[PDB]
């Protein structure tokens, strides 16, 4: 038969679903959350990424959310309720320089499965486009797993290329909706 290496799509470990949040106050938060499309290969990822707008070009109050097929971009989802997020705080000047660069590095960390065995703990990621300052976060399934959370946050910091002086905080979803850092790297 034919060597599949000449015609086959490069498959990912997980199928990923990209979501979009359009800020509307007349509707509830969940009503604004909409699904864009699903992909489970490398080519289909770039087929989606190339035709959508960058995070810097969105309106204030819009979110991109890339999660595993089956997990919704909210804390009340089974996979999310017991975990938390590695938050990256950006300023207004980092929208031009860092925002689109950090988000695509974040996207490649998810689909590329860059955290070894602890890539299974990863639920997804979401970029917040706000006028007061942009935010990027990687969500995990369990905040109690110390070894899992610490590895993801360390390797994620190394991928983005953040200086050692910059300190980022992991905060759980249960503490955010009731903020304090459970871990720092």
């Amino acid at each position: 038969v034919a060597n599949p290496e000449h015609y086959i799509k490069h498959p990912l470990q997980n199928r990923w679903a990209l979501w979009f949040f359009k800020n509307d106050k007349s509707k509830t938060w969940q009503a604004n959350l909409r699904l864009i499309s699903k992909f489970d290969t490398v080519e289909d990822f770039w087929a989606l990424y190339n035709h959508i707008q960058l995070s810097s070009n969105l309106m204030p109050g819009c979110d991109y959310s890339l999660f595993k097929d089956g997990i919704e971009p909210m804390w009340e989802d089974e996979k999310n309720k017991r975990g938390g997020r590695w938050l990256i705080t950006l300023n207004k000047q980092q929208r031009r320089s860092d925002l689109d660069r950090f988000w695509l590095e974040t996207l490649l960390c998810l689909i590329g499965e860059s955290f070894d065995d602890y890539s299974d703990d990863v639920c997804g990621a979401v970029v917040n486009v706000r006028a007061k300052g942009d935010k990027i976060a990687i969500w995990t399934t369990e905040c109690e797993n110390r070894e899992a959370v610490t590895h993801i946050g360390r390797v994620y910091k190394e991928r983005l290329g953040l200086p050692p002086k910059i300190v980022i905080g992991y905060q759980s979803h249960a503490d955010t909706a009731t903020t304090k850092n459970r871990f720092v790297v």
Partner: peptide, 14 residues
Amino acid sequence: KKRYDREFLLGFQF
């Protein structure tokens, strides 16, 4: 099981 390098993935952009 299925893992990729960042520089391998960037080559499939165009």
